[PDB]
């Protein structure tokens, strides 16, 4: 699968984020900025197994989304509102918006219930998605 998919890059990113905890922050800071990274990681999360188990992808998504408030809000929007990428540009048109799995539920729960400066805003965003939905 590593040869025929993009999963190898996600396994490398997971290793960078998780192998040495003391470096996680730095790695997350280096990984958050890249455009369409969260959309791509979500797409790989919701795709059939391609050489990377769901928990590791969830760990990557959570660690990126928690490294700053803006990215956390972007991840919430990707999971709930619009997961498409923000002829060479990434598209990620293939998946319906807002689809839920055990992985997405766990990621959203960790984003909401993780205590840090952005938690309020994240909760706020969550509640917004509720009201808008209603």
């Amino acid at each position: 699968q590593v040869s025929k998919t993009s999963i190898g890059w996600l396994r490398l990113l997971h290793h960078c984020l998780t192998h040495i905890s003391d470096l996680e922050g730095m790695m997350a800071s280096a990984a958050a900025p890249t455009a369409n990274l969260l959309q791509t990681c979500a797409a790989l999360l919701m795709s059939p197994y391609c050489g990377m188990h769901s928990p590791n992808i969830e760990v990557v998504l959570v660690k990126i989304g928690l490294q700053s408030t803006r990215i956390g809000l972007k991840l919430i929007d990707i999971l709930l509102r619009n997961c498409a990428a923000s002829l060479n540009s990434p598209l990620l048109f293939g998946r319906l918006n807002g689809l839920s799995s055990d992985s997405t539920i766990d990621i959203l729960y960790q984003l909401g219930t993780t205590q840090d400066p952005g938690t309020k805003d994240r909760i706020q965003a969550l509640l917004k998605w509720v009201s808008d939905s209603a």
């Binding site: 919701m46 059939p48 319906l96």
Partner: protein, 70 residues
Amino acid sequence: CRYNLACHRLETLLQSIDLPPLNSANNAQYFLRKPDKAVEEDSRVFSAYQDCIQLQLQLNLAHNAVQRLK
């Protein structure tokens, strides 16, 4: 009474039965390869449903025989 018990069994087994919508690749794979637990749940559902249908047939036959006698 027996058919009510069978219906309760089928009801309790079906209330835990969930059907993933065919709107994503993962659900499509679920339908392509039914997971083992899904297979066991379907076997139990089929057994309970067969019991319910047999008891329903017996109940309707008994009701029609009672109507013949009345």
